[model samples]
Target: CDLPQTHSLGNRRALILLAQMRRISPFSCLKDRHDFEFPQEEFDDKQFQKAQAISVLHEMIQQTFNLFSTKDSSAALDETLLDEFYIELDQQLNDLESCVMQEVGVIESPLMYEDSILAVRKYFQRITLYLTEKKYSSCAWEVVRAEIMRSFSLSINLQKRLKSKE
Candidate 1:
């Protein structure tokens, strides 16, 4: 178990970072997430795995976004714009999607109860599409919000579930 001071400081830092994240436009939507708690047993289950998967996807999105800007600064790139940035972004998205589909796709299930994961994925999809369609700003912080919120929820769900079981 973590010491009280350590846990409290961690929580405090999380709250502070969350607050800062909410101050932005796109990220503000993630400030208050759907609060749900499932058993740890269930967490390692489908939903839980989905949560982890979403986190991984979000990270990939962040990496792609950073790489996108660094590689080219063309103002003409949009969601469907077929420029160098567009091609690169498409390749990154395809690679990410391929990796995710391989893992999650193996179950042959209907992809049920994975709303959080799907939600985050779609959020990135929309953002990337928007970026590709020329609806962009220095709003990379939105990606940060997606990454943080999914992570926060995963931590809370797992921690509570585990602590209770212990």
Candidate 2:
């Protein structure tokens, strides 16, 4: 954390892999097409709802952290990277929240729907249980971090897809 603020940890993707290169594995890519369906009617800003939902997802991330933070094994693995990851998530969440407010509302932004609630909860549930199964190993945290970084990037892009509608 003492490092300069100019070099944001989140942007240093390679740095994350620097010390984690020992357990490297081969890449696996698939060619499956993806599609999603949504309700036809409009009730609120889709961008805002998505942004708010992403924010809520971060809240769940923090909850998972609290649930597992102190439970790390007594092994001598250096876990400070987890702290860096946590701080980065919070910073990213703050930046997104500000941008979301600027996109539409501050006092009355639209809330996400029940579908979002259930979907995000299901995702976190999967990870939390999987981490328990993996015994919260460093590699497991790395896997979750990689997944979450992609998830947030996808969430941010989701807003962009709808930002064009405004």
Candidate 3:
């Protein structure tokens, strides 16, 4: 039976495309990147957990942008990669949101951290739509760059905000 379209990557080909792109530039940096690792033995330290998780996602996103922006890094954006990256990024954002929700329930200044997460998610959606058009022009690339940078800006702000608490 020809299945109907779905938002999630349920089809085999879609999943395969995502898997292939996961091995390519931008996301490849996430593999073996132990710059930020959470403790295996978890404790009741909510602050540390929140900060560590956010920092890890932030660093990964930052590296992805770095690879995408650099010319000689063999990290060029294509339709397949873009789609897969968007899927992976959406999951990251979900994790970020979950962290924010968990901490905001007990934090002093919750809005700042929650807003930052929302901002990043918003920019991600904008970038996904911009890439979906498949324009493949310098202008399109610049627009995507600007949107991506906005997400990075929010991420850095969150990092600083979280750091100040500790």
Task: Enumerate clash totals for all models, in the order shown.
Answer: 5, 0, 0
TM-score of 2: 0.50
How many times do residue backbones clash in model 3?
0
lDDT for predicted candidate 1 compared with the true structure: 0.40
- Give residue 107's lDDT in candidate 1 (0 to 100): 30
TM-score for each of the candidates: 0.31, 0.50, 0.31
**What would the TM-score be for candidate 1 when compared with the true structure?**
0.31
Which candidate has the highest lDDT of all? 2
Segments of candidate 1 deviating more than 4 angstroms: 1-15, 24-45, 49-125, 137-147, 159-166
Instruction: Give per-residue CA lDDT, model 3, range 75-153, as digits (tens).
Output: 3456556546556655555555465566544223456445433444444444445544553333344444433433333
Of the pair 1 and 2, which is ahead by lDDT? 2
